[PDB]
Amino acid sequence: FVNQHLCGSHLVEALYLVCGERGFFYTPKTKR
């Protein structure tokens, strides 16, 4: 698949587009 890297707010923005209408977890670890 695609050779892209994302860090900080750029990784949050990609997760917001893929998941922000369902909800998501951006914390380094959680109870999942």
Binding site: F1, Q4, L6, L11, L15, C19, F25, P28
Partner: peptide
Amino acid sequence: GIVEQCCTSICSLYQLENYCNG
């Protein structure tokens, strides 16, 4: 977790869906 997986290696939309609610 989530913050290292695309910063230290590569990710796609199918890998971002791992961090979705569920």
